[PDB]
Protein backbone atom coordinates (compact mmCIF):
# COMPACT_ATOMS: atom_id res chain seq x y z
CA UNK A 1 0.00 0.00 0.00
CA UNK A 2 0.89 3.63 -0.55
CA UNK A 3 -1.07 6.76 0.29
CA UNK A 4 -1.00 10.24 -1.20
CA UNK A 5 -2.90 13.48 -0.63
CA UNK A 6 -3.78 16.45 -2.85
CA UNK A 7 -5.30 19.91 -2.30
CA UNK A 8 -5.67 22.35 -5.21
CA UNK A 9 -5.83 26.15 -5.45
CA UNK A 10 -9.64 26.08 -5.14
CA UNK A 11 -9.62 24.08 -1.93
CA UNK A 12 -10.66 20.76 -3.47
CA UNK A 13 -9.06 17.79 -1.72
CA UNK A 14 -8.38 14.15 -2.54
CA UNK A 15 -6.90 11.36 -0.43
CA UNK A 16 -5.95 8.13 -2.18
CA UNK A 17 -4.77 4.87 -0.66
CA UNK A 18 -4.18 2.02 -3.11
CA UNK A 19 -2.19 -1.19 -3.10
CA UNK A 20 -1.10 -4.58 -4.46
CA UNK A 21 -1.37 -5.67 -0.80
CA UNK A 22 2.12 -6.89 0.14
CA UNK A 23 5.22 -5.28 -1.40
CA UNK A 24 5.16 -6.01 -5.16
CA UNK A 25 2.08 -8.13 -4.48
CA UNK A 26 2.48 -11.66 -5.86
CA UNK A 27 5.49 -10.38 -7.77
CA UNK A 28 3.82 -11.78 -10.88
CA UNK A 29 3.63 -9.61 -14.00
CA UNK A 30 0.61 -10.26 -16.22
CA UNK A 31 2.07 -11.59 -19.45
CA UNK A 32 3.57 -8.87 -21.64
CA UNK A 33 1.56 -6.10 -19.97
CA UNK A 34 4.32 -5.15 -17.54
CA UNK A 35 1.67 -4.97 -14.80
CA UNK A 36 2.31 -6.60 -11.40
CA UNK A 37 -0.56 -8.62 -9.92
CA UNK A 38 -1.96 -8.08 -6.42
CA UNK A 39 -2.31 -10.69 -3.68
CA UNK A 40 -5.35 -9.00 -2.14
CA UNK A 41 -7.12 -12.33 -1.67
CA UNK A 42 -5.18 -12.81 1.57
CA UNK A 43 -7.36 -10.05 3.05
CA UNK A 44 -10.31 -12.46 3.16
CA UNK A 45 -10.59 -14.78 6.15
CA UNK A 46 -9.31 -18.10 4.74
CA UNK A 47 -10.83 -20.05 7.61
CA UNK A 48 -12.74 -18.77 10.67
CA UNK A 49 -10.36 -17.94 13.50
CA UNK A 50 -7.10 -18.28 11.55
CA UNK A 51 -5.02 -15.10 11.09
CA UNK A 52 -3.84 -13.73 7.75
CA UNK A 53 -0.49 -12.07 7.05
CA UNK A 54 -1.34 -9.07 9.27
CA UNK A 55 -2.66 -11.13 12.16
CA UNK A 56 -6.25 -10.24 11.35
CA UNK A 57 -9.05 -12.77 11.76
CA UNK A 58 -12.60 -13.20 10.53
CA UNK A 59 -15.61 -15.42 10.04
CA UNK A 60 -18.63 -15.42 7.75
CA UNK A 61 -18.73 -11.68 7.07
CA UNK A 62 -15.26 -11.60 5.49
CA UNK A 63 -15.18 -15.17 4.16
CA UNK A 64 -14.00 -15.70 0.58
CA UNK A 65 -16.82 -15.62 -1.96
CA UNK A 66 -17.23 -15.15 -5.72
CA UNK A 67 -17.16 -11.50 -6.85
CA UNK A 68 -16.76 -10.41 -3.23
CA UNK A 69 -14.49 -7.52 -2.20
CA UNK A 70 -12.10 -8.57 0.57
CA UNK A 71 -12.23 -6.46 3.72
CA UNK A 72 -9.63 -3.70 3.83
CA UNK A 73 -8.15 -1.46 6.54
CA UNK A 74 -7.23 1.35 4.12
CA UNK A 75 -8.23 4.70 5.55
CA UNK A 76 -7.82 7.76 3.32
CA UNK A 77 -9.16 10.42 5.69
CA UNK A 78 -10.23 14.05 5.84
CA UNK A 79 -10.91 15.96 9.04
CA UNK A 80 -13.09 19.07 8.96
CA UNK A 81 -12.55 22.07 11.25
CA UNK A 82 -14.94 25.03 11.42
CA UNK A 83 -16.79 23.63 8.42
CA UNK A 84 -13.72 23.48 6.19
CA UNK A 85 -11.34 20.77 5.01
CA UNK A 86 -8.56 20.86 7.58
CA UNK A 87 -6.50 17.66 7.53
CA UNK A 88 -6.02 15.28 4.60
CA UNK A 89 -4.17 12.11 5.52
CA UNK A 90 -3.78 8.35 5.17
CA UNK A 91 -1.11 5.65 5.26
CA UNK A 92 -0.04 2.09 4.39
CA UNK A 93 0.46 -0.58 7.05
CA UNK A 94 -2.10 -3.33 6.58
CA UNK A 95 -3.83 -3.79 9.92
CA UNK A 96 -1.90 -0.82 11.34
CA UNK A 97 -3.47 1.70 8.96
CA UNK A 98 -6.40 2.24 11.34
CA UNK A 99 -4.22 3.09 14.33
CA UNK A 100 -1.66 5.12 12.38
CA UNK A 101 -4.37 7.36 10.96
CA UNK A 102 -6.10 7.46 14.34
CA UNK A 103 -2.88 8.80 15.84
CA UNK A 104 -2.60 11.47 13.16
CA UNK A 105 -6.11 12.65 14.09
CA UNK A 106 -5.51 12.54 17.86
CA UNK A 107 -2.11 14.22 17.52
CA UNK A 108 -3.69 17.03 15.48
CA UNK A 109 -6.83 17.56 17.54
CA UNK A 110 -5.94 16.62 21.11
CA UNK A 111 -2.24 17.47 21.21
CA UNK A 112 -2.35 20.40 18.78
CA UNK A 113 0.73 19.22 16.86
CA UNK A 114 1.43 20.76 13.46
CA UNK A 115 1.28 18.31 10.57
CA UNK A 116 5.04 17.67 10.59
CA UNK A 117 5.09 17.17 14.38
CA UNK A 118 2.15 14.74 14.19
CA UNK A 119 3.91 12.86 11.40
CA UNK A 120 7.31 12.49 13.09
CA UNK A 121 5.89 11.49 16.48
CA UNK A 122 6.29 7.79 17.43
CA UNK A 123 3.43 5.32 16.95
CA UNK A 124 1.94 2.46 18.98
CA UNK A 125 -0.66 -0.15 18.09
CA UNK A 126 -2.88 -2.86 19.56
CA UNK A 127 -5.08 -5.03 17.36
CA UNK A 128 -6.65 -7.31 19.99
CA UNK A 129 -5.04 -10.40 18.48
CA UNK A 130 -2.21 -10.93 18.91
CA UNK A 131 -2.50 -9.56 22.44
CA UNK A 132 0.45 -7.17 22.44
CA UNK A 133 0.94 -3.41 22.60
CA UNK A 134 3.17 -2.85 19.59
CA UNK A 135 5.41 0.22 19.75
CA UNK A 136 8.02 1.92 17.60
CA UNK A 137 11.28 3.26 18.97
CA UNK A 138 10.73 6.66 20.58
CA UNK A 139 8.72 6.21 23.76
CA UNK A 140 10.24 7.06 27.13
CA UNK A 141 11.58 4.15 29.20
CA UNK A 142 9.65 5.67 32.11
CA UNK A 143 6.43 5.54 30.09
CA UNK A 144 6.99 1.99 28.88
CA UNK A 145 7.60 0.76 32.43
CA UNK A 146 4.33 2.36 33.54
CA UNK A 147 2.51 0.62 30.69
CA UNK A 148 3.98 -2.74 31.68
CA UNK A 149 2.90 -2.09 35.27
CA UNK A 150 -0.61 -1.51 33.91
CA UNK A 151 -0.51 -4.96 32.35
CA UNK A 152 0.27 -4.04 28.76
CA UNK A 153 2.49 -6.50 26.90
CA UNK A 154 4.84 -4.07 25.14
CA UNK A 155 6.50 -5.30 21.96
CA UNK A 156 9.11 -3.15 20.21
CA UNK A 157 8.79 -3.70 16.47
CA UNK A 158 9.48 -2.28 13.00
CA UNK A 159 8.45 1.28 12.12
CA UNK A 160 4.77 1.66 11.19
CA UNK A 161 3.38 3.47 8.15
CA UNK A 162 4.13 6.32 5.80
CA UNK A 163 1.74 9.22 6.29
CA UNK A 164 1.59 11.78 3.49
CA UNK A 165 -0.55 14.64 4.76
CA UNK A 166 -1.77 18.18 4.13
CA UNK A 167 -3.25 20.56 6.70
CA UNK A 168 -5.24 23.57 5.50
CA UNK A 169 -4.92 26.82 7.42
CA UNK A 170 -7.81 29.18 8.28
CA UNK A 171 -6.63 31.46 5.48
CA UNK A 172 -6.29 28.75 2.83
CA UNK A 173 -2.55 28.43 3.44
CA UNK A 174 -1.27 24.85 3.00
CA UNK A 175 1.01 22.87 5.32
CA UNK A 176 2.34 19.45 4.40
CA UNK A 177 4.43 16.59 5.71
CA UNK A 178 6.00 13.43 4.35
CA UNK A 179 7.01 10.58 6.66
CA UNK A 180 10.52 10.13 8.08
CA UNK A 181 9.94 6.38 7.82
CA UNK A 182 9.95 6.54 4.01
CA UNK A 183 13.04 7.76 2.16
CA UNK A 184 12.80 9.44 -1.26
CA UNK A 185 9.25 10.70 -0.70
CA UNK A 186 8.13 14.30 -1.05
CA UNK A 187 5.50 16.88 -0.17
CA UNK A 188 5.68 19.90 -2.43
CA UNK A 189 3.47 22.67 -3.70
CA UNK A 190 3.36 26.14 -5.22
Amino acid sequence: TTHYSVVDKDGNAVAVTYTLNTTFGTGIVAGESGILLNNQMDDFSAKPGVPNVYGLVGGDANAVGPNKRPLSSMSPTIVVKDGKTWLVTGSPGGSRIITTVLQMVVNSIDYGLNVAEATNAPRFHHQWLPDELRVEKGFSPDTLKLLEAKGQKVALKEAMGSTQSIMVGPDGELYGASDPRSVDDLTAGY
Binding site: L36, Y111, H126, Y175
Partner: protein
Protein backbone atom coordinates in the same frame (compact mmCIF):
# COMPACT_ATOMS: atom_id res chain seq x y z
CA UNK B 1 9.76 26.75 18.77
CA UNK B 2 9.06 23.72 16.58
CA UNK B 3 11.55 20.91 16.00
CA UNK B 4 9.56 19.68 13.00
CA UNK B 5 8.42 22.04 10.25
CA UNK B 6 5.74 21.44 7.61
CA UNK B 7 6.34 22.21 3.94
CA UNK B 8 4.42 25.37 3.03
CA UNK B 9 2.59 26.47 -0.12
CA UNK B 10 -0.04 29.10 -0.89
CA UNK B 11 -1.92 27.54 -3.81
CA UNK B 12 -1.70 23.77 -4.26
CA UNK B 13 0.10 20.86 -2.62
CA UNK B 14 0.80 17.16 -3.17
CA UNK B 15 2.18 14.65 -0.66
CA UNK B 16 3.27 11.20 -1.83
CA UNK B 17 5.80 8.45 -1.12
CA UNK B 18 7.77 9.31 -4.27
CA UNK B 19 9.49 12.54 -5.32
CA UNK B 20 8.91 12.02 -9.05
CA UNK B 21 5.21 11.21 -8.59
CA UNK B 22 4.73 14.21 -6.31
CA UNK B 23 6.27 16.51 -8.90
CA UNK B 24 3.99 15.04 -11.56
CA UNK B 25 1.01 15.96 -9.40
CA UNK B 26 2.27 19.48 -8.78
CA UNK B 27 2.86 20.05 -12.49
CA UNK B 28 -0.71 18.95 -13.24
CA UNK B 29 -1.99 21.48 -10.69
CA UNK B 30 0.21 24.18 -12.21
CA UNK B 31 -1.21 23.34 -15.64
CA UNK B 32 -4.71 24.02 -14.35
CA UNK B 33 -5.96 20.58 -13.37
CA UNK B 34 -7.97 20.16 -10.17
CA UNK B 35 -7.25 17.92 -7.19
CA UNK B 36 -8.86 14.90 -8.85
CA UNK B 37 -6.93 15.44 -12.10
CA UNK B 38 -3.67 15.61 -10.14
CA UNK B 39 -4.61 12.65 -7.94
CA UNK B 40 -5.20 10.45 -10.99
CA UNK B 41 -1.96 11.65 -12.60
CA UNK B 42 -0.08 10.80 -9.40
CA UNK B 43 -1.77 7.40 -9.23
CA UNK B 44 -0.65 6.55 -12.74
CA UNK B 45 2.86 7.88 -12.11
CA UNK B 46 3.25 5.76 -8.95
CA UNK B 47 2.19 2.70 -10.96
CA UNK B 48 5.51 3.25 -12.76
CA UNK B 49 7.88 4.75 -10.18
CA UNK B 50 6.66 2.84 -7.12
CA UNK B 51 5.98 -0.73 -8.35
CA UNK B 52 6.05 -1.79 -4.68
CA UNK B 53 2.51 -0.48 -4.21
CA UNK B 54 1.68 2.07 -6.91
CA UNK B 55 -0.22 -0.04 -9.42
CA UNK B 56 -2.55 -0.84 -12.29
CA UNK B 57 -2.89 -4.44 -11.10
CA UNK B 58 -4.23 -3.79 -7.62
CA UNK B 59 -6.98 -1.73 -6.04
CA UNK B 60 -7.81 0.90 -3.46
CA UNK B 61 -9.99 3.72 -2.19
CA UNK B 62 -10.33 7.45 -2.80
CA UNK B 63 -11.89 10.11 -0.58
CA UNK B 64 -12.95 13.26 -2.42
CA UNK B 65 -14.13 16.50 -0.83
CA UNK B 66 -15.04 19.41 -3.08
CA UNK B 67 -14.42 23.03 -2.15
CA UNK B 68 -18.19 23.19 -1.57
CA UNK B 69 -18.11 20.51 1.11
CA UNK B 70 -19.45 17.60 -0.95
CA UNK B 71 -17.65 14.54 0.42
CA UNK B 72 -17.70 11.15 -1.28
CA UNK B 73 -15.83 7.84 -1.40
CA UNK B 74 -14.77 5.77 -4.39
CA UNK B 75 -14.49 2.02 -3.86
CA UNK B 76 -12.14 0.46 -6.40
CA UNK B 77 -11.26 -2.55 -4.27
CA UNK B 78 -10.60 -5.77 -6.19
CA UNK B 79 -13.43 -8.27 -6.68
CA UNK B 80 -12.71 -11.95 -6.08
CA UNK B 81 -12.98 -13.98 -9.31
CA UNK B 82 -16.37 -15.49 -10.15
CA UNK B 83 -14.80 -18.93 -9.67
CA UNK B 84 -13.48 -18.09 -6.20
CA UNK B 85 -14.78 -20.31 -3.40
CA UNK B 86 -14.94 -20.12 0.40
CA UNK B 87 -12.35 -22.86 1.01
CA UNK B 88 -10.07 -22.16 -1.97
CA UNK B 89 -7.05 -21.45 0.24
CA UNK B 90 -7.32 -24.54 2.43
CA UNK B 91 -4.92 -27.46 1.96
CA UNK B 92 -6.09 -31.07 1.86
CA UNK B 93 -6.18 -31.08 5.66
CA UNK B 94 -8.38 -28.00 5.90
CA UNK B 95 -5.65 -25.62 7.02
CA UNK B 96 -5.06 -22.29 5.24
CA UNK B 97 -2.02 -22.27 2.95
CA UNK B 98 -0.51 -18.77 2.95
CA UNK B 99 1.45 -19.61 -0.19
CA UNK B 100 -1.80 -19.91 -2.11
CA UNK B 101 -3.19 -16.57 -0.94
CA UNK B 102 0.08 -14.63 -1.17
CA UNK B 103 2.36 -16.00 -3.89
CA UNK B 104 0.28 -18.17 -6.24
CA UNK B 105 -1.86 -16.95 -9.13
CA UNK B 106 -4.88 -17.69 -6.91
CA UNK B 107 -3.86 -14.80 -4.66
CA UNK B 108 -5.10 -12.16 -7.11
CA UNK B 109 -8.41 -10.34 -7.16
CA UNK B 110 -9.73 -8.59 -10.28
CA UNK B 111 -7.89 -5.19 -10.37
CA UNK B 112 -9.93 -2.05 -9.80
CA UNK B 113 -7.43 0.83 -9.95
CA UNK B 114 -7.98 1.75 -13.60
CA UNK B 115 -11.77 1.62 -13.16
CA UNK B 116 -11.60 3.70 -9.99
CA UNK B 117 -9.39 6.40 -11.46
CA UNK B 118 -11.64 6.75 -14.52
CA UNK B 119 -14.82 6.87 -12.45
CA UNK B 120 -13.31 9.73 -10.43
CA UNK B 121 -11.76 11.49 -13.42
CA UNK B 122 -14.91 11.40 -15.55
CA UNK B 123 -17.23 12.68 -12.82
CA UNK B 124 -15.05 14.90 -10.63
CA UNK B 125 -12.06 15.73 -12.84
CA UNK B 126 -11.59 18.17 -15.72
CA UNK B 127 -8.82 16.65 -17.86
CA UNK B 128 -9.03 13.77 -20.36
CA UNK B 129 -7.48 10.44 -19.35
CA UNK B 130 -4.76 10.77 -22.00
CA UNK B 131 -3.50 13.99 -20.39
CA UNK B 132 -3.17 12.58 -16.87
CA UNK B 133 -1.62 9.31 -18.07
CA UNK B 134 1.05 10.98 -20.25
CA UNK B 135 3.54 11.68 -17.42
CA UNK B 136 3.48 8.03 -16.33
CA UNK B 137 3.73 6.89 -19.95
CA UNK B 138 6.94 8.88 -20.47
CA UNK B 139 8.42 7.54 -17.23
CA UNK B 140 7.73 3.97 -18.35
CA UNK B 141 8.98 4.53 -21.90
CA UNK B 142 12.11 6.59 -21.18
CA UNK B 143 12.80 5.20 -17.71
CA UNK B 144 13.92 6.75 -14.44
CA UNK B 145 16.87 6.34 -12.07
CA UNK B 146 16.48 3.74 -9.32
CA UNK B 147 16.73 5.46 -5.93
CA UNK B 148 17.45 4.17 -2.42
CA UNK B 149 13.82 3.35 -1.67
CA UNK B 150 13.27 1.27 -4.80
CA UNK B 151 16.70 -0.36 -4.70
CA UNK B 152 16.15 -1.36 -1.07
CA UNK B 153 12.68 -2.77 -1.70
CA UNK B 154 13.78 -4.74 -4.77
CA UNK B 155 16.59 -6.34 -2.77
CA UNK B 156 14.58 -7.01 0.39
CA UNK B 157 11.00 -7.77 -0.66
CA UNK B 158 11.49 -8.19 -4.40
CA UNK B 159 14.03 -10.99 -4.00
CA UNK B 160 11.33 -13.20 -2.50
CA UNK B 161 9.07 -13.14 -5.57
CA UNK B 162 10.21 -11.16 -8.64
CA UNK B 163 13.00 -13.49 -9.81
CA UNK B 164 10.61 -16.47 -9.63
CA UNK B 165 8.59 -15.32 -12.65
CA UNK B 166 10.18 -14.90 -16.09
CA UNK B 167 8.34 -11.76 -17.13
CA UNK B 168 8.86 -10.07 -13.76
CA UNK B 169 12.56 -10.96 -13.66
CA UNK B 170 13.06 -9.57 -17.18
CA UNK B 171 11.92 -6.16 -15.95
CA UNK B 172 13.19 -5.78 -12.38
CA UNK B 173 16.31 -7.95 -12.34
CA UNK B 174 19.62 -7.25 -14.06
CA UNK B 175 22.77 -9.36 -14.36
CA UNK B 176 21.22 -11.84 -11.94
CA UNK B 177 20.66 -9.21 -9.25
CA UNK B 178 17.88 -6.78 -8.39
CA UNK B 179 18.35 -3.40 -10.09
CA UNK B 180 20.72 -1.29 -8.01
CA UNK B 181 20.63 2.36 -6.97
CA UNK B 182 21.76 4.42 -9.94
CA UNK B 183 20.52 1.95 -12.54
CA UNK B 184 17.82 3.03 -14.98
CA UNK B 185 14.48 1.25 -14.91
CA UNK B 186 12.73 1.23 -18.28
CA UNK B 187 9.35 -0.52 -18.51
CA UNK B 188 8.50 -0.83 -22.21
CA UNK B 189 5.63 -3.27 -21.79
CA UNK B 190 4.03 -1.13 -19.09
CA UNK B 191 4.51 1.87 -21.38
CA UNK B 192 2.54 0.09 -24.10
CA UNK B 193 -0.23 -0.70 -21.62
CA UNK B 194 -0.32 2.94 -20.53
CA UNK B 195 -0.39 4.17 -24.13
CA UNK B 196 -3.32 1.91 -25.02
CA UNK B 197 -5.30 2.99 -21.95
CA UNK B 198 -4.63 6.63 -22.83
CA UNK B 199 -5.87 6.08 -26.39
CA UNK B 200 -8.72 3.62 -25.85
CA UNK B 201 -9.80 4.42 -22.30
CA UNK B 202 -10.33 2.09 -19.31
CA UNK B 203 -11.96 -0.55 -21.53
CA UNK B 204 -8.45 -1.36 -22.75
CA UNK B 205 -7.72 -2.77 -19.29
CA UNK B 206 -11.04 -4.52 -18.68
CA UNK B 207 -11.93 -5.67 -22.19
CA UNK B 208 -8.94 -5.03 -24.44
CA UNK B 209 -5.41 -6.33 -24.93
CA UNK B 210 -4.48 -5.91 -21.27
CA UNK B 211 -7.52 -7.94 -20.21
CA UNK B 212 -6.42 -10.68 -22.61
CA UNK B 213 -2.89 -10.64 -21.15
CA UNK B 214 -4.22 -10.94 -17.60
CA UNK B 215 -6.65 -13.72 -18.52
CA UNK B 216 -3.92 -15.69 -20.32
CA UNK B 217 -1.43 -15.26 -17.47
CA UNK B 218 -4.06 -16.77 -15.19
CA UNK B 219 -5.30 -19.52 -17.51
CA UNK B 220 -1.77 -20.82 -18.12
CA UNK B 221 -0.82 -20.89 -14.44
CA UNK B 222 -3.88 -22.08 -12.54
CA UNK B 223 -5.24 -18.60 -11.86
CA UNK B 224 -8.94 -17.71 -11.83
CA UNK B 225 -9.31 -14.20 -13.27
CA UNK B 226 -11.11 -14.48 -16.60
CA UNK B 227 -12.20 -12.01 -19.25
CA UNK B 228 -15.74 -12.24 -17.86
CA UNK B 229 -14.35 -11.20 -14.47
CA UNK B 230 -12.59 -8.20 -15.97
CA UNK B 231 -15.62 -7.17 -18.02
CA UNK B 232 -17.85 -7.42 -14.94
CA UNK B 233 -15.66 -5.36 -12.63
CA UNK B 234 -16.86 -1.96 -11.53
CA UNK B 235 -15.69 0.74 -9.16
CA UNK B 236 -18.46 1.93 -6.84
CA UNK B 237 -19.11 5.38 -5.42
CA UNK B 238 -20.27 4.99 -1.81
CA UNK B 239 -21.27 7.24 1.08
CA UNK B 240 -18.32 7.98 3.39
CA UNK B 241 -18.39 6.80 7.00
CA UNK B 242 -18.04 9.76 9.33
CA UNK B 243 -18.21 10.95 12.90
CA UNK B 244 -17.77 13.96 15.16
CA UNK B 245 -14.82 14.19 17.53
CA UNK B 246 -14.88 17.21 19.84
CA UNK B 247 -16.52 19.33 17.15
CA UNK B 248 -14.32 18.11 14.29
CA UNK B 249 -15.96 15.93 11.64
CA UNK B 250 -13.96 12.94 10.46
CA UNK B 251 -14.59 11.31 7.07
CA UNK B 252 -13.11 8.04 5.82
CA UNK B 253 -13.83 4.86 3.88
CA UNK B 254 -17.00 2.76 4.37
CA UNK B 255 -17.28 -1.01 3.86
CA UNK B 256 -15.62 -2.84 2.02
CA UNK B 257 -13.12 -0.98 4.18
CA UNK B 258 -13.18 -1.25 7.97
CA UNK B 259 -11.11 1.91 8.34
CA UNK B 260 -13.77 4.58 8.62
CA UNK B 261 -15.93 2.60 11.02
CA UNK B 262 -13.18 1.74 13.48
CA UNK B 263 -11.47 5.12 13.36
CA UNK B 264 -14.82 6.73 14.21
CA UNK B 265 -15.63 4.05 16.79
CA UNK B 266 -12.31 4.52 18.58
CA UNK B 267 -12.55 8.31 18.44
CA UNK B 268 -16.03 7.98 19.95
CA UNK B 269 -14.54 5.97 22.80
CA UNK B 270 -11.63 8.38 23.32
CA UNK B 271 -13.96 11.38 23.36
CA UNK B 272 -14.99 10.27 26.86
CA UNK B 273 -11.46 10.93 28.14
CA UNK B 274 -9.53 14.19 28.50
CA UNK B 275 -6.82 13.14 26.04
CA UNK B 276 -5.29 16.62 25.84
CA UNK B 277 -4.77 16.49 29.61
CA UNK B 278 -2.82 13.23 29.48
CA UNK B 279 -0.70 14.39 26.55
CA UNK B 280 1.28 12.65 23.83
CA UNK B 281 3.56 9.83 24.90
CA UNK B 282 2.03 9.54 28.36
CA UNK B 283 1.31 6.10 29.78
CA UNK B 284 -2.27 7.16 30.47
CA UNK B 285 -3.00 8.27 26.90
CA UNK B 286 -1.39 5.14 25.47
CA UNK B 287 -3.24 2.91 27.93
CA UNK B 288 -6.64 4.38 27.04
CA UNK B 289 -6.01 4.14 23.31
CA UNK B 290 -4.61 0.60 23.44
CA UNK B 291 -7.68 -0.57 25.34
CA UNK B 292 -10.13 1.22 23.05
CA UNK B 293 -8.38 -0.33 20.05
CA UNK B 294 -8.89 -3.86 21.41
CA UNK B 295 -12.68 -3.60 21.32
CA UNK B 296 -12.63 -2.16 17.81
CA UNK B 297 -10.52 -4.96 16.36
CA UNK B 298 -12.63 -7.55 18.17
CA UNK B 299 -15.71 -6.04 16.51
CA UNK B 300 -13.85 -5.91 13.19
CA UNK B 301 -13.39 -9.69 13.26
CA UNK B 302 -17.13 -10.32 13.42
CA UNK B 303 -19.09 -7.51 11.79
CA UNK B 304 -17.02 -6.27 8.86
CA UNK B 305 -17.21 -7.38 5.25
CA UNK B 306 -18.32 -6.42 1.74
CA UNK B 307 -21.64 -4.56 2.27
CA UNK B 308 -22.98 -5.92 -1.02
CA UNK B 309 -22.85 -9.41 0.50
CA UNK B 310 -23.49 -8.87 4.20
CA UNK B 311 -25.26 -6.24 6.27
CA UNK B 312 -22.69 -4.28 8.28
CA UNK B 313 -24.05 -2.75 11.54
CA UNK B 314 -22.16 0.48 10.93
CA UNK B 315 -24.72 2.63 12.74
CA UNK B 316 -24.36 0.61 15.94
CA UNK B 317 -20.57 0.42 15.65
CA UNK B 318 -20.30 4.21 15.32
CA UNK B 319 -22.98 4.92 17.94
CA UNK B 320 -21.74 7.16 20.76
CA UNK B 321 -23.83 5.34 23.39
CA UNK B 322 -22.12 2.09 22.38
CA UNK B 323 -18.76 3.85 22.54
CA UNK B 324 -19.66 5.05 26.03
CA UNK B 325 -20.43 1.49 27.15
CA UNK B 326 -16.90 0.57 26.05
CA UNK B 327 -15.23 3.61 27.61
CA UNK B 328 -16.81 2.72 30.97
CA UNK B 329 -15.02 -0.65 30.77
CA UNK B 330 -11.55 0.85 30.40
CA UNK B 331 -9.44 0.87 33.56
CA UNK B 332 -6.66 3.43 33.15
CA UNK B 333 -4.56 1.43 35.61
CA UNK B 334 -5.26 -2.11 34.40
CA UNK B 335 -5.28 -3.55 30.88
CA UNK B 336 -7.96 -6.11 30.03
CA UNK B 337 -6.57 -9.28 28.38
CA UNK B 338 -7.83 -9.83 24.83
CA UNK B 339 -9.04 -13.25 25.97
CA UNK B 340 -11.68 -11.42 28.03
CA UNK B 341 -12.79 -9.29 25.08
CA UNK B 342 -15.33 -10.43 22.50
CA UNK B 343 -17.28 -8.66 19.74
CA UNK B 344 -19.76 -6.30 21.38
CA UNK B 345 -23.50 -6.86 21.75
CA UNK B 346 -24.95 -4.35 19.28
CA UNK B 347 -28.66 -5.08 19.80
CA UNK B 348 -29.20 -2.19 22.27
CA UNK B 349 -27.78 0.21 19.67
CA UNK B 350 -29.43 -1.09 16.50
Amino acid sequence: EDVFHPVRAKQGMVASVDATATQVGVDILKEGGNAVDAAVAVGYALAVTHPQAGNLGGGGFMLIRSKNGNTTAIDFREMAPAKATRDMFLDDQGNPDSKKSLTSHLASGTPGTVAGFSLALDKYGTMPLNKVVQPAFKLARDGFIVNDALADDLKTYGSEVLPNHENSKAIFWKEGEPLKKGDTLVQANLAKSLEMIAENGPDEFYKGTIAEQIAQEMQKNGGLITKEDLAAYKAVERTPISGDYRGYQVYSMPPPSSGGIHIVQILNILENFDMKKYGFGSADAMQIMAEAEKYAYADRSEYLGDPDFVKVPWQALTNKAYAKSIADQIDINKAKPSSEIRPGKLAPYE
